[PDB]
Design a protein around this motif. Structure first.
Motif, short mmCIF file in Angstrom:
data_model
loop_
_atom_site.label_atom_id
_atom_site.label_comp_id
_atom_site.label_asym_id
_atom_site.label_seq_id
_atom_site.Cartn_x
_atom_site.Cartn_y
_atom_site.Cartn_z
N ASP A 1 -11.39 -2.53 -2.67
CA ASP A 1 -10.07 -2.62 -2.08
C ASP A 1 -9.95 -3.93 -1.30
OD1 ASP A 1 -11.57 -2.02 0.23
OD2 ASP A 1 -10.75 0.01 0.43
N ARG B 1 0.82 -1.20 0.00
CA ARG B 1 0.00 0.00 0.00
C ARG B 1 0.86 1.27 0.00
NH1 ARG B 1 -5.50 -0.43 2.01
NH2 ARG B 1 -5.12 1.60 3.01
N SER C 1 -2.55 2.26 -4.78
CA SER C 1 -3.82 2.78 -4.28
C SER C 1 -4.97 2.17 -5.07
CB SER C 1 -3.87 4.28 -4.36
OG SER C 1 -2.89 4.89 -3.53
N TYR C 2 -6.15 2.11 -4.45
CA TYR C 2 -7.33 1.51 -5.05
C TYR C 2 -8.31 2.61 -5.45
CZ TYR C 2 -5.67 -2.71 -2.57
OH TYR C 2 -4.91 -3.73 -2.08
#
Length: 254
Positions: A37, A15, A19-20
């Motif tokens: 996510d 992470r 990023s989602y």
């Protein structure tokens, strides 16, 4: 000369790189999948990133998937960006993509930020012609003459069905041009020295996703859950993504 990579070695996506994009609102194309996510839709396994689209009731949508990017953590200007990818059987409905946006997005609105699609597959013309896992495209979308949306698209028909094995999808990006490759062989090229293409002389960041469907007038031609006939779950395996540096390469990390 690898100066940046993701080998997807661990058991969870990093992470501090990724990023989602979360939502199920169509992403400007009438896409049906809700990008989440969750480990269900994006996870690491046996040295691979796996993005998994599923037929599943979620957040108002009939499909889940994932849509990940490295904006804010990784961007670059100039270089060869290559990814080793086994795309799922797109059959009819699945729309996986490997692509990039200008690093000023979303501050600078689309398409002024600039877009470079390295791999797209699962298009409607491919369905019609019966070349579902063969016909791909690269593309440039940008703000051209008059700041107007300009799309350059190059189609290619692969010799073999690309869902049966991993293939190398690459861009070579220099001050003069952007070139696109399948397994080291060029299938797309554009000069980017023109005054209206200055947007391709800034940092860009990569994006990976697996979309499900689209507006009829958009990429897949299939706009309802019932029109999606593809095998689900559909999994895109990404063994790695690497940046082969040029002398002129500008690397952005945080």
């Amino acid at each position: 000369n690898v100066i940046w990579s993701q080998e997807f070695d661990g058991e969870s996506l990093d992470r501090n790189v990724w990023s989602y994009d979360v939502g199920g609102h169509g992403f400007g194309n009438g896409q049906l999948e809700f990008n989440t996510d969750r480990p269900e839709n994006a996870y690491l396994r046996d040295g691979n990133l796996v993005i998994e689209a599923r037929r599943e009731a979620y957040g108002g949508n009939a499909f889940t998937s994932a849509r990940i990017h490295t904006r804010g953590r990784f961007a670059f200007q100039y270089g060869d960006l290559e990814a080793r990818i086994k795309v799922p059987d797109t059959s009819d409905g699945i729309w996986p993509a490997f692509w990039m946006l200008g690093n000023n997005f979303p501050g600078t609105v689309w398409p002024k930020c600039g877009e470079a699609d390295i791999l797209e597959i699962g298009g409607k013309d491919g369905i019609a012609k019966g070349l579902q896992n063969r016909q791909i495209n690269c593309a440039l979308h940008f703000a051209g003459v008059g700041e107007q949306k300009t799309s350059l698209v190059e189609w290619f028909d692969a010799p073999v069905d690309l869902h049966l094995d991993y293939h190398l999808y690459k861009i070579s990006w220099t001050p003069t041009h952007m070139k696109f490759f399948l397994d080291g062989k060029e299938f797309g090229s554009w000069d980017i020295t023109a005054s209206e293409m200055k947007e391709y002389h800034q940092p860009f960041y990569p994006i990976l996703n697996v979309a499900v469907g689209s507006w009829t007038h958009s990429y897949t031609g299939l706009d309802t859950p019932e029109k999606i006939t593809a095998t689900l779950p559909a999994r895109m395996y990404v063994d790695w993504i690497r940046l082969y540096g040029h002398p002129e390469t500008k690397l952005v990390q945080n």
